[PDB]
Coordinates of all heavy atoms in Angstrom, one line a residue:
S1 N 105.6 -13.8 -85.8 CA 105.8 -14.5 -87.1 C 105.6 -13.6 -88.2 O 106.6 -13.1 -88.9 CB 104.8 -15.7 -87.3 OG 103.4 -15.2 -87.5
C2 N 104.4 -13.1 -88.4 CA 104.1 -12.3 -89.6 C 104.4 -10.8 -89.5 O 104.4 -10.1 -90.6 CB 102.7 -12.6 -89.9 SG 101.7 -11.5 -88.8
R3 N 104.2 -10.3 -88.3 CA 104.4 -8.9 -88.0 C 103.4 -8.0 -88.8 O 103.7 -6.9 -89.1 CB 105.8 -8.6 -88.2 CG 106.3 -7.4 -87.4 CD 107.3 -7.8 -86.4 NE 108.6 -7.5 -86.9 CZ 109.7 -7.4 -86.1 NH1 109.6 -7.6 -84.8 NH2 110.9 -7.1 -86.7
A4 N 102.2 -8.6 -89.1 CA 101.2 -7.8 -89.9 C 99.7 -8.0 -89.6 O 98.9 -7.5 -90.5 CB 101.5 -8.1 -91.3
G5 N 99.3 -8.6 -88.5 CA 97.9 -8.8 -88.2 C 97.3 -9.9 -88.9 O 96.1 -10.2 -88.8
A6 N 98.1 -10.6 -89.7 CA 97.6 -11.8 -90.4 C 97.9 -13.1 -89.6 O 98.0 -14.2 -90.3 CB 98.3 -11.8 -91.8
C7 N 98.0 -13.1 -88.3 CA 98.2 -14.4 -87.6 C 97.9 -14.3 -86.1 O 97.2 -13.4 -85.7 CB 99.6 -14.8 -87.9 SG 100.7 -14.5 -86.6
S8 N 98.4 -15.2 -85.2 CA 98.2 -15.2 -83.8 C 99.3 -15.5 -82.9 O 99.2 -15.1 -81.7 CB 97.1 -16.2 -83.6 OG 97.6 -17.4 -84.2
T9 N 100.4 -16.1 -83.3 CA 101.6 -16.3 -82.5 C 102.0 -15.3 -81.4 O 102.5 -15.6 -80.3 CB 102.7 -16.6 -83.5 OG1 102.2 -17.6 -84.3 CG2 104.2 -16.9 -82.9
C10 N 101.8 -14.0 -81.8 CA 102.1 -12.9 -80.9 C 100.7 -12.7 -80.4 O 99.8 -12.4 -81.3 CB 102.6 -11.7 -81.7 SG 101.3 -10.8 -82.5
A11 N 100.3 -12.9 -79.2 CA 98.9 -12.7 -78.7 C 99.2 -12.5 -77.3 O 100.2 -13.1 -76.7 CB 98.0 -13.9 -78.8
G12 N 98.4 -11.7 -76.7 CA 98.5 -11.4 -75.3 C 97.1 -11.0 -74.9 O 96.2 -10.8 -75.7
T13 N 97.0 -10.9 -73.6 CA 95.7 -10.6 -73.1 C 95.9 -9.4 -72.1 O 96.6 -9.5 -71.1 CB 95.1 -11.8 -72.3 OG1 95.1 -12.9 -73.2 CG2 93.6 -11.5 -71.9
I14 N 95.4 -8.3 -72.6 CA 95.6 -7.1 -71.8 C 94.6 -7.2 -70.7 O 93.4 -7.4 -70.8 CB 95.3 -6.0 -72.8 CG1 96.0 -4.8 -72.2 CG2 93.9 -5.8 -73.2 CD1 96.7 -3.8 -73.2
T15 N 95.4 -7.3 -69.6 CA 94.8 -7.6 -68.3 C 94.1 -6.3 -68.0 O 92.9 -6.4 -67.9 CB 96.1 -8.0 -67.5 OG1 97.0 -8.5 -68.4 CG2 95.9 -9.2 -66.5
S16 N 94.7 -5.1 -67.8 CA 93.9 -4.0 -67.6 C 94.4 -2.8 -68.4 O 95.7 -2.7 -68.6 CB 93.7 -3.7 -66.1 OG 93.2 -4.7 -65.3
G17 N 93.6 -1.9 -68.9 CA 94.0 -0.7 -69.6 C 93.4 -0.7 -71.0 O 92.4 -1.3 -71.4
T18 N 94.1 0.1 -71.9 CA 93.8 0.3 -73.3 C 94.9 0.3 -74.3 O 96.0 0.8 -74.0 CB 93.0 1.6 -73.4 OG1 91.9 1.4 -72.6 CG2 92.5 1.9 -74.7
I19 N 94.5 -0.3 -75.4 CA 95.3 -0.4 -76.7 C 94.6 0.0 -78.0 O 93.3 0.1 -77.9 CB 95.7 -1.9 -76.7 CG1 97.2 -1.8 -76.9 CG2 95.1 -2.7 -77.7 CD1 97.9 -3.2 -76.7
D20 N 95.2 0.2 -79.1 CA 94.6 0.4 -80.4 C 95.1 -0.7 -81.3 O 96.4 -0.8 -81.5 CB 95.1 1.7 -81.1 CG 94.8 1.7 -82.6 OD1 93.6 1.8 -82.9 OD2 95.6 1.5 -83.5
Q21 N 94.3 -1.6 -81.8 CA 94.8 -2.7 -82.7 C 94.7 -2.1 -84.1 O 95.8 -1.9 -84.7 CB 94.0 -3.9 -82.6 CG 94.0 -4.3 -81.1 CD 94.3 -5.7 -80.9 OE1 95.4 -6.2 -81.2 NE2 93.3 -6.4 -80.4
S22 N 93.5 -1.9 -84.6 CA 93.2 -1.3 -85.9 C 93.7 -2.0 -87.1 O 92.9 -2.6 -87.8 CB 93.7 0.2 -86.0 OG 92.6 1.0 -85.4
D23 N 95.0 -2.1 -87.1 CA 95.9 -2.7 -88.0 C 95.6 -4.2 -88.2 O 95.9 -4.7 -89.2 CB 97.3 -2.4 -87.6 CG 97.4 -0.9 -87.3 OD1 96.8 -0.1 -88.1 OD2 98.0 -0.6 -86.3
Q24 N 95.1 -4.8 -87.1 CA 94.8 -6.2 -87.1 C 93.9 -6.7 -88.2 O 92.9 -6.1 -88.6 CB 94.0 -6.6 -85.7 CG 92.5 -6.6 -85.6 CD 91.9 -5.2 -85.8 OE1 92.2 -4.2 -85.1 NE2 90.9 -5.0 -86.7
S25 N 94.2 -7.9 -88.7 CA 93.4 -8.5 -89.8 C 92.9 -9.9 -89.4 O 92.0 -10.4 -90.2 CB 94.2 -8.8 -91.0 OG 95.5 -8.1 -91.0
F26 N 93.4 -10.5 -88.4 CA 93.1 -11.9 -87.9 C 92.1 -12.0 -86.7 O 91.3 -12.9 -86.7 CB 94.4 -12.6 -87.6 CG 94.4 -14.1 -87.4 CD1 95.0 -15.0 -88.3 CD2 93.8 -14.7 -86.3 CE1 95.1 -16.3 -88.1 CE2 93.8 -16.1 -86.1 CZ 94.5 -16.9 -87.0
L27 N 92.2 -11.2 -85.7 CA 91.3 -11.4 -84.5 C 89.9 -11.0 -84.9 O 89.8 -9.9 -85.4 CB 91.9 -10.7 -83.3 CG 93.2 -11.1 -82.8 CD1 93.6 -10.1 -81.7 CD2 93.1 -12.5 -82.1
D28 N 88.9 -11.8 -84.7 CA 87.6 -11.4 -84.9 C 86.9 -10.9 -83.6 O 87.2 -11.3 -82.5 CB 86.8 -12.6 -85.5 CG 86.3 -13.8 -84.6 OD1 86.5 -13.8 -83.4 OD2 85.8 -14.7 -85.2
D29 N 86.0 -9.9 -83.8 CA 85.3 -9.3 -82.7 C 85.3 -9.9 -81.2 O 86.0 -9.4 -80.3 CB 83.9 -9.0 -83.1 CG 83.6 -7.6 -83.6 OD1 84.5 -6.9 -84.2 OD2 82.4 -7.2 -83.5
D30 N 84.6 -11.1 -81.1 CA 84.6 -11.8 -79.8 C 85.9 -12.1 -79.2 O 86.1 -11.9 -78.0 CB 83.9 -13.1 -80.2 CG 82.4 -13.3 -79.8 OD1 81.6 -12.3 -79.9 OD2 82.0 -14.4 -79.5
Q31 N 86.9 -12.3 -80.0 CA 88.3 -12.5 -79.6 C 88.8 -11.2 -79.1 O 89.6 -11.2 -78.1 CB 89.1 -13.0 -80.7 CG 89.0 -14.5 -80.8 CD 90.1 -15.2 -81.6 OE1 90.2 -14.9 -82.8 NE2 91.0 -16.0 -81.1
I32 N 88.5 -10.0 -79.6 CA 89.0 -8.7 -79.1 C 88.2 -8.3 -77.9 O 88.8 -7.7 -77.0 CB 89.0 -7.5 -80.2 CG1 88.1 -6.4 -79.9 CG2 88.6 -8.1 -81.6 CD1 88.2 -5.2 -80.9
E33 N 86.9 -8.6 -77.8 CA 86.1 -8.3 -76.7 C 86.6 -9.1 -75.4 O 86.4 -8.6 -74.3 CB 84.6 -8.6 -76.9 CG 83.7 -8.1 -75.7 CD 82.2 -8.4 -75.7 OE1 81.4 -8.0 -76.6 OE2 81.7 -9.1 -74.8
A34 N 87.1 -10.3 -75.6 CA 87.5 -11.1 -74.5 C 89.0 -10.9 -74.1 O 89.7 -11.8 -73.6 CB 87.2 -12.5 -74.8
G35 N 89.6 -9.8 -74.5 CA 91.0 -9.5 -74.1 C 92.1 -9.8 -75.1 O 93.3 -9.7 -74.6
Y36 N 91.9 -10.2 -76.3 CA 93.0 -10.5 -77.1 C 93.6 -9.4 -77.9 O 92.9 -8.6 -78.6 CB 92.7 -11.8 -78.0 CG 92.8 -13.1 -77.3 CD1 91.7 -14.0 -77.2 CD2 94.0 -13.5 -76.6 CE1 91.8 -15.2 -76.5 CE2 94.0 -14.7 -75.9 CZ 93.0 -15.5 -75.9 OH 93.1 -16.7 -75.3

């Protein structure tokens, strides 16, 4: 939708491995610790 970290429509759960969000403005800590 927004293409800018200001929302959730595009969400996935990284089943295994690593990513860099950084740019994110909407997911809060607990949400990123639980795979979002």
Side-chain angles (χ1 to χ4, degrees):
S1 65
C2 81
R3 205 113 98 163
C7 100
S8 54
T9 306
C10 77
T13 306
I14 199 145
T15 336
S16 301
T18 298
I19 230 172
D20 164 71
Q21 302 227 69
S22 274
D23 311 320
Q24 93 298 305
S25 345
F26 193 116
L27 295 172
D28 73 6
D29 262 31
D30 260 35
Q31 276 199 294
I32 113 174
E33 186 188 295
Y36 282 122

